[PDB]
Amino acid sequence: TTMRSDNQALSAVQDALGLGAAKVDTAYSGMESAIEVVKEIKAKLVAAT
Amino acid sequence: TTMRSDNQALSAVQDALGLGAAKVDTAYSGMESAIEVVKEIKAKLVAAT
């Protein structure tokens, strides 16, 4: 009974980890977009010299 | 990523170098024209002495 309860808890933790992975993927995609935009800004500023 | 940003910066530097080369070429052409005109002036004056 205790091991079955622990297995259910582990399944819940796995679902939470999937949710967290989705959040991290979204945030990292935003980070990549920010990297690209910042690189473009730096290139424009260098051309502005 | 840092190298790609540097490559973009060097591309901007190349564009700036091309613009500066065009400016220098125009200035040099005008300078040569002025030199020729002043040489003509000197020839005329030494004829007029």
From Swiss-Prot, chains A, B:
Record's subcellular location: Secreted; Bacterial flagellum
Domain of life: Bacteria
Job description of the protein: Flagellin is the subunit protein which polymerizes to form the filaments of bacterial flagella. Homomer of FlaA is able to form a functional filament.
Family: Belongs to the bacterial flagellin family.
Stated name of the protein: Flagellin A
Native species: Rhizobium meliloti (Ensifer meliloti)
Gene that specifies this protein: flaA
Parent-record interval covered: 51 to 99 of 395
